[PDB]
Amino acid sequence: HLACTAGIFDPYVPPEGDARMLTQRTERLRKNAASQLAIRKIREFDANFKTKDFPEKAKDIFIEAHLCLNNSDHDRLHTLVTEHCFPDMVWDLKYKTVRWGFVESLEPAQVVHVRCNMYGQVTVRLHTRQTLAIYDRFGRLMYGQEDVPKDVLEYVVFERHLMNPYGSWRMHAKIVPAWAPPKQPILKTLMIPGPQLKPWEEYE
Amino acid sequence: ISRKWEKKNKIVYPPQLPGEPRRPAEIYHCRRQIKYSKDKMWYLAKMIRGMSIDQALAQLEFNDKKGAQIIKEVLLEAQDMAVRDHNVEFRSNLHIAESTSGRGQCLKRIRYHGRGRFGIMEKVYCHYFVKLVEGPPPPPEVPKTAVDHAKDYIQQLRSRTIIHTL
Amino acid sequence: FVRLTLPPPKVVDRWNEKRALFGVYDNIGILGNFEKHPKELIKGPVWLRGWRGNELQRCVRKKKFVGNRMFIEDLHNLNKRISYLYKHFNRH
Amino acid sequence: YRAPPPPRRRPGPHSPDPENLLTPRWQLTPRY
Amino acid sequence: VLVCPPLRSRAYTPPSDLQSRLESHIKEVLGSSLPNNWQDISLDDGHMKFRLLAGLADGLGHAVPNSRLHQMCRVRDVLDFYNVPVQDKSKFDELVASNLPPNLKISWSY
Amino acid sequence: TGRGTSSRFLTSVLHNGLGRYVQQLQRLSLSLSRDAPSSRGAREFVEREVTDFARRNPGVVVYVNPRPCAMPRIVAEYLNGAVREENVNSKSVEEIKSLVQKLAD
Amino acid sequence: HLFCGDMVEILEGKDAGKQGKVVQVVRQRNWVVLEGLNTHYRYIGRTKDHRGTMIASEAPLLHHQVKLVDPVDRKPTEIQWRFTEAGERVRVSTRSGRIIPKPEFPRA
RNA sequence: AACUAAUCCUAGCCCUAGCCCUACAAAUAUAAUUAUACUAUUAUAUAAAUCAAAACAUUUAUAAAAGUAUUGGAGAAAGAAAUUCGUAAGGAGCUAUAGAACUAGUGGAAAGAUGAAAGACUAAUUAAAAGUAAGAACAAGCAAAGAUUAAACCUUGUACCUUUUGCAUAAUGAACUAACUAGAAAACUUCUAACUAAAAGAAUUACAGCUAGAAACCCCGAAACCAAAC
């Protein structure tokens, strides 16, 4: 049984400068021609799905899922996110302790684009300041700052199984806009090994 | 069979506080099944105790015993995971804190003899245990000088207490 | 060496029908006008109902009671066991 | 619980079946 | 359709007007209305004993024990038997209401 | 045994008797079971002698906690922090009283 | 009384109280499998190169952990086996007696 | 926190009760299992001895009356009838060195252990035996004891079991760890009670007896002897 499908039905293209940006909401009003028919399909199974109010529900799941990481609440996070999302979140956090906190959101979350036997994926736009600090098995700090807020803008895709009676909205994937700044680098320094050659061969 | 050496590598310490020195890394690696005598392997372990990672590797490369080659392979595996999984920045910054060998489960057979005699044949197996601490090997011990020896003797004389008296 | 695991918890009911009704009619003879002797209420091997004896006596009585219904193998074994028992008690 | 009915010996004459092999001979004699 | 009445305590204290209830019981139970030397009257009569003891038990609230039943030959025994107090208070209950000192702590975990 | 056992020198806690004597024992705890033959002797002790000891020594905290218990136990705590436990299983009133007096001293 | 395709309510388990359709029945262990219910998440394709892909895998449910559902009223009604006019055995609810027709299951 | 190891409960059994029983093809007694001719085709005398009689010889068991009488190297022991009387699934058993030898007749063994789910990455749990490692040793001595500020020094002290004389500087036996491994019967007495010139739920004893209860006597090991097979 699969309650989620990897990938996005149609990839929404974020416009550069959207962080600076009513306005964008009207752009959705202009673009509901592409998306309203999709919105109707979610509405048909639910009838209470509105692009205006979904971000509030979507935001809680996103924040709640991040909180589970600190407590390693795998069972709780399992419900919040889809099967595809869960392994990525926690696989690289094995044998690590992370302190994550959510600072006030810079801008309100808004639905951006939705698509849809039937799996509905809703893109949500979120800019929020957060604090991240990850330590080693020995407790040594390896990445992030304990109490430094980092402002990050990303687009988060939630998914639900419309056909299933118990289907619910669970975080599936995140769309990263190209104009977003690169993530902070690791504290430690890495070494790139040189080319490997056989005894007969010579360096090139 | 007990495999508590591996569990020592699965230990996760609590997050270190700001007012705490950076914890040195400790790695526990072992090979459970080796077709070699523990007693013979122990000699190799004893010599390498306390030496640096590079110094031990160099000696192993020029060692004639079969166990030494196995030890070098075991050492290389531990070093690789240490950087890959134990967040070791420098490959050279490793030294042999502990090295020892243990008995392993053997196989039993009957040893025939050409003159009608028989014997108990045993196929020996052993375990090899090593713990590696990140950092250079500790400085070697310095023999006590005559001044140090005399001071202790005088201190002992002063420390003497009267026995069995009011 | 000793167990490293706990045994299953056990609770015993002392007022079950078997225990509750245990001993009833033990006074059948005195309270029943002696029409039925309490020995008549003994349940067990036929050759020792209402009768007691030493191990040799019990085996001998068993042989007589069910000798016609005993297996040849059992009968042969009983005879051999009886012979050893007879010598020990009657000579040592 | 309620105690079971008291055991009772069957009264009255009882005639063994002569044809039955199991019935002991002494129970079929005129003295019987 | 049968409902149990509330359980009744076995604690009995001699009434202040003990004789009043006693004599009234005899005055009613006994036709002679408490005759001379009532204390020394015998209770061997079955009918009189049942009426007197039952009436006293209901009115007073204390009943003669079956083990002590035969001892009630004379009214003197009945009068003496009733006048002795009976308390249901447990030993722990008595200890609780015994001016517990500050350094002594009691807690009933049952 | 002396070689295999520890020893100490004569000493006093803090010169207790120089100015005024202070009782080291600070707390006594008694556990009892309402229905247990082992506690019968302890059961009677509470009725008769527990009060007298409390009056004689009012500076010791006394705890009496009847509870379902397999074996009654007495716990004595001292000012210095020493704690000693004595089982009262199937012990008479006289035995209990003697032990308490020794503990106080 | 449980057959593949039967709508049943999970008396106890991870998804207790969620009605599902049977898809596999291991009668030897009295196990009933409901698709999309009592479904845990596990890694498929775990290999040296890749960690693996999370998938939802159903877990067995014992027979006592499920009960049949009356079509008109969705409840875990106890059923009793009785024949029909055609002679085919049909489970009948002990209370609110009704015929639960045998479900249609696609060929494996 | 280590190694070697250890950990577990059902694999199953035992005794009574109940119950008698009447549970593919192809090839085969030739050379059994060789699809058709050979070549006729066929068990079994008292059971004895061993054993007991401390050897050995006649001899030696295999409901009440009653262990009375007789018999018997009168000894180890053997022992009627008359005459009365006679309807009718469980375990103060065992649980992988225990219980059947057994998971198995594979003369005759050895052994297995996660969880509800492995279509949840196969489980944990234990300073736990001896043996080792972590951590070689430091004048002096049955290895400890009294001690001591102090591990060793100073002081005191002729390993153990059994057996010899109530003595070993004799002599036997012991590499060590775990499990297994040797006293069993009531005729009479004392004691505990019931009832009493009577006692006992039939068969017994009685001039205080009679009835019930309680109280007891090992293990391993020959050279041998005989029967029946091979």
PDB file of C-alpha atoms in Angstrom, chain E residues 32-76:
ATOM      1  CA  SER E  32     -47.599  -7.376  86.824  1.00  0.00           C
ATOM      2  CA  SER E  33     -45.900  -4.065  85.886  1.00  0.00           C
ATOM      3  CA  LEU E  34     -42.475  -4.559  87.454  1.00  0.00           C
ATOM      4  CA  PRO E  35     -43.443  -6.531  90.583  1.00  0.00           C
ATOM      5  CA  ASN E  36     -41.427  -6.909  93.766  1.00  0.00           C
ATOM      6  CA  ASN E  37     -37.879  -8.247  93.414  1.00  0.00           C
ATOM      7  CA  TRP E  38     -38.041  -7.942  89.631  1.00  0.00           C
ATOM      8  CA  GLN E  39     -34.243  -8.235  89.506  1.00  0.00           C
ATOM      9  CA  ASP E  40     -34.441 -11.777  90.913  1.00  0.00           C
ATOM     10  CA  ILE E  41     -37.168 -12.937  88.504  1.00  0.00           C
ATOM     11  CA  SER E  42     -36.343 -16.080  86.533  1.00  0.00           C
ATOM     12  CA  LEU E  43     -36.357 -16.140  82.726  1.00  0.00           C
ATOM     13  CA  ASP E  44     -36.765 -19.909  82.296  1.00  0.00           C
ATOM     14  CA  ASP E  45     -40.120 -19.380  80.572  1.00  0.00           C
ATOM     15  CA  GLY E  46     -39.559 -19.502  76.827  1.00  0.00           C
ATOM     16  CA  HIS E  47     -42.366 -17.108  75.918  1.00  0.00           C
ATOM     17  CA  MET E  48     -41.415 -14.551  78.569  1.00  0.00           C
ATOM     18  CA  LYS E  49     -37.715 -14.766  77.701  1.00  0.00           C
ATOM     19  CA  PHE E  50     -38.358 -14.193  73.991  1.00  0.00           C
ATOM     20  CA  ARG E  51     -40.677 -11.238  74.603  1.00  0.00           C
ATOM     21  CA  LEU E  52     -38.456  -9.626  77.239  1.00  0.00           C
ATOM     22  CA  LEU E  53     -35.149 -10.142  75.424  1.00  0.00           C
ATOM     23  CA  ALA E  54     -36.553  -9.274  71.993  1.00  0.00           C
ATOM     24  CA  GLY E  55     -38.335  -6.185  73.295  1.00  0.00           C
ATOM     25  CA  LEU E  56     -35.281  -5.020  75.226  1.00  0.00           C
ATOM     26  CA  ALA E  57     -33.024  -5.638  72.225  1.00  0.00           C
ATOM     27  CA  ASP E  58     -35.242  -3.605  69.895  1.00  0.00           C
ATOM     28  CA  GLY E  59     -35.830  -0.785  72.370  1.00  0.00           C
ATOM     29  CA  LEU E  60     -32.281  -0.720  73.724  1.00  0.00           C
ATOM     30  CA  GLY E  61     -30.593  -1.856  70.503  1.00  0.00           C
ATOM     31  CA  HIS E  62     -28.324  -4.473  72.119  1.00  0.00           C
ATOM     32  CA  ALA E  63     -28.936  -8.214  71.793  1.00  0.00           C
ATOM     33  CA  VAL E  64     -27.864 -11.123  73.993  1.00  0.00           C
ATOM     34  CA  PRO E  65     -25.151 -13.273  72.359  1.00  0.00           C
ATOM     35  CA  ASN E  66     -26.161 -16.842  71.597  1.00  0.00           C
ATOM     36  CA  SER E  67     -23.107 -18.101  73.487  1.00  0.00           C
ATOM     37  CA  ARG E  68     -24.186 -15.926  76.433  1.00  0.00           C
ATOM     38  CA  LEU E  69     -27.882 -16.690  75.882  1.00  0.00           C
ATOM     39  CA  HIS E  70     -28.151 -19.466  78.474  1.00  0.00           C
ATOM     40  CA  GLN E  71     -26.515 -17.315  81.169  1.00  0.00           C
ATOM     41  CA  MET E  72     -29.586 -15.028  81.191  1.00  0.00           C
ATOM     42  CA  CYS E  73     -31.441 -17.007  83.843  1.00  0.00           C
ATOM     43  CA  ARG E  74     -32.327 -13.979  85.996  1.00  0.00           C
ATOM     44  CA  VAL E  75     -33.110 -10.327  85.335  1.00  0.00           C
ATOM     45  CA  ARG E  76     -30.007  -9.405  87.341  1.00  0.00           C
TER      46      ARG E  76
END
